[PDB]
Amino acid sequence: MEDEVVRFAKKMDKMVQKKNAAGALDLLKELKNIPMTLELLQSTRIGMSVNAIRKQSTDEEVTSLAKSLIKSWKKLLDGGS
């Protein structure tokens, strides 16, 4: 589970660098199936990648998926026990 997310982060990073993240859609849909934990988010930093991809999205589905991912992930970060 964790390395797969690290893989997505490294893949996504190249898309923001290329100023076209339309293709990130699939990588974002993949993340939607993984039970993300706060612990995983600290190690993977995937939330930062997805937030950047949300700006470089171009396709509305990508922005929508990234927006949906971060919506769930927020509670993990907003969880002070």
Q: Which method, experimentally, gave rise to this model?
A: NMR
Q: How far apart are CA 64 and CA 53, in angstroms?
A: 11
What's the maximum distance between 2 C-alpha atoms anywhere in the chain?
39
Tell me if the domain spanning 1-78 has CATH number 1.20.210.10.
no
- Joined tokens for residue 59: 């396709």
Please report, for the chain, the start and end positions of each structural domain, with discontinuous segments joined by +: 1-78
Q: Angle at the Cα of 21 (from 61 to 26), degrees rounded to 5? A: 55
54: closest CA among 42, 43, 66, 46? Answer: 66
Phi, psi of 74 (to 5 degrees): -60, -45
